[PDB]
């Protein structure tokens, strides 16, 4: 079919956009994982608040990681990078792209359109205009097409997977694992957790790791490892969801 031919190409391209798992050690001096945590989660709120196309956020994070992989950045200038990555991500994925002014508004006008636009060329050029990158969502749909599940079911899987993908994107995992893994780990965690609540329904869960790793052509222990990592990230939302007081 054309499933494999595209998929093969998706995976090639996936690897041409891969960031460096080492950039905090090697490239960055000021910037630390906790700061990226703050920008990523800031970006997520913007995409949510602005009801952006969901593939915008994970696309911007790709840009951000691939840039931190190539350029050292002052922390004071990180949020600006977040903004720019969303600026370009949105332009790439949205019929009504985010406004530079609307983006700076979200920084409480800490940054300015003129700065944003300087960055855009920085970012775009560093990435060599290789921007139609893959997202976890691109794969989720693919895997979903291969699966024998009623459209009602695929909707719920699709919903949950994309939650997980967001969880991942605000984590360093997203730097280590390509969207194919992120998508599969998320589908695997989603479908599995749905099979529990509703046994004898999401029975695509059944050895879904091997299935999806057969597609991705990946070590199924990594998909198992990835899945667990996600399942843990989710738990770590038990902390956030409540401690908002003190």
């Amino acid at each position: 079919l054309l499933n494999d031919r595209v998929l093969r190409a998706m995976l090639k391209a996936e690897e041409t956009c891969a960031p460096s798992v080492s950039y905090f050690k090697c490239v960055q001096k000021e910037v630390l994982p906790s700061m990226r945590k703050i920008v990523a989660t800031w970006m997520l709120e913007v995409c949510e608040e602005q009801k952006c196309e969901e593939e915008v956020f994970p696309l911007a994070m790709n840009y951000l990681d691939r840039f931190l992989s190539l350029e050292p950045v002052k922390k004071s200038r990180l949020q600006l990078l977040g903004a720019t990555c969303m600026f370009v991500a949105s332009k790439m994925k949205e019929t009504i792209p985010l406004t530079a002014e609307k983006l700076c508004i979200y920084t409480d006008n800490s940054i300015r359109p003129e700065e944003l636009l300087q960055m855009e060329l920085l970012l775009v050029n560093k990435l060599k205009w290789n921007l139609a990158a893959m997202t976890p969502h691109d794969f989720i749909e693919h895997f979903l097409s291969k699966m024998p599940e009623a459209e009602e079911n695929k909707q719920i899987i699709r919903k949950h997977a994309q939650t997980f993908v967001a969880l991942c994107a605000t984590d360093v995992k997203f730097i280590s694992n390509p969207p194919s893994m992120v998508a599969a780990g998320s589908v695997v965690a989603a479908v599995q957790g749905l099979n529990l609540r509703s046994p004898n329904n999401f029975l695509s869960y059944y050895r879904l790791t091997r299935f999806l790793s057969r597609v991705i052509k990946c070590d199924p222990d990594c998909l198992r490892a990835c899945q667990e990592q996600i399942e843990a990230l989710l738990e770590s939302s038990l902390r956030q969801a409540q401690q908002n007081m003190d």
């Binding site: 332009k91 792209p97 406004t99 530079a100 775009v124 205009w129």
Partner: protein, 291 residues
């Protein structure tokens, strides 16, 4: 300039401006540095420029043989109302003209054609698959470095270069444009197939099969060979959109081409239908009796 590339010769000037040629210092390879001007909006890079260029880079990871690679891109000059973007490219050594000009053959061969075409359709069918359609499908925008290859070129670019007609230029070598391309402005995918048969013929073994100038002049030039279609195969609507004026009939193919085979005539006919619908497919062609 400027770019981490060192230019040399200047393989061409034309529609897409000057097409100079450089080496990749820390790679040690040849590169075809093209270029373009786009407007510096208040919202930065033209949404349509980022999207168009981005897609051309979403290709190098197919490594398709008969298409050239956008190797790199760079937005060099920012200034209020203009950014300049050098498109670094894969570099063939020579083109289909320099190929058919340095032609030892007196008329032939055919298996240096039948392959060479069945090839040409390949890259076209690919670019089409990915939703790309070519404007300037020409012997300028077709090439081979050596060993025979046929890497199609200057694909897509038309969208990115819309800002060119702010220079309202230049060559306008309208030898190949589809019966629609300037009878209207349809920019369909089939119109990209027409330009094929026009190169298909020109290969046996001469110069343009329909070079003229005027839109209608070429339009009528075209009718001379194919034969003026009666309605309802007759569209609209603008830009001195002439109706049927000079009335003609269907002329044999091999006639003015020396000389198409049994099918080579019949296929180029399927190719060069007026009606883009009952035209031919970039693929269905690519597997005709003519092979």
């Amino acid at each position: 300039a400027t770019s981490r590339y060192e230019p040399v010769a200047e393989i061409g000037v034309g529609a897409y401006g000057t097409v100079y040629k450089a080496r990749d210092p820390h790679s040690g390879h040849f590169v075809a540095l093209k270029s373009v001007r786009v407007p510096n909006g208040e919202e930065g890079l033209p949404i349509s420029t980022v999207r168009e260029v981005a897609l051309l880079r979403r290709l190098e990871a197919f490594e398709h043989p008969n298409v050239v690679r956008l190797m790199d891109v760079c937005a060099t000059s920012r200034t209020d109302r203009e950014i300049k973007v050098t498109l670094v490219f894969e570099h063939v050594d020579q083109d289909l003209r320099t190929y058919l000009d340095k032609a030892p053959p007196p008329g032939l061969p055919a298996e240096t054609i039948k392959d060479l075409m069945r090839q040409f359709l390949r890259g076209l069918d690919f670019l089409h698959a990915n939703c790309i359609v070519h404007r300037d499908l020409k012997p300028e925008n077709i090439l081979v470095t050596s060993g025979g290859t046929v890497k199609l070129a200057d694909f897509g670019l038309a969208r990115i270069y819309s800002y060119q007609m702010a220079l309202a230029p230049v060559v306008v070598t309208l030898w190949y444009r589809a019966p629609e391309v300037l009878l209207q402005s349809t920019y369909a995918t089939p119109v990209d197939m027409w330009s094929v048969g026009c190169i298909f013929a020109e290969m046996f073994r001469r110069k343009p099969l329909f070079c003229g100038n005027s839109e209608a002049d070429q339009l009528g030039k075209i009718f001379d060979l194919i034969g003026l279609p009666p309605e309802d195969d007759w569209p609209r609507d603008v830009s001195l959109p002439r109706g049927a004026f000079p009335p003609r009939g269907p002329r044999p193919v091999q006639s003015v081409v020396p000389e198409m085979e049994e099918s080579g005539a019949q296929l180029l006919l399927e190719m060069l239908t007026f009606n883009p619908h009952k035209r031919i497919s970039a693929f269905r062609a690519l597997q005709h009796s003519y092979l």
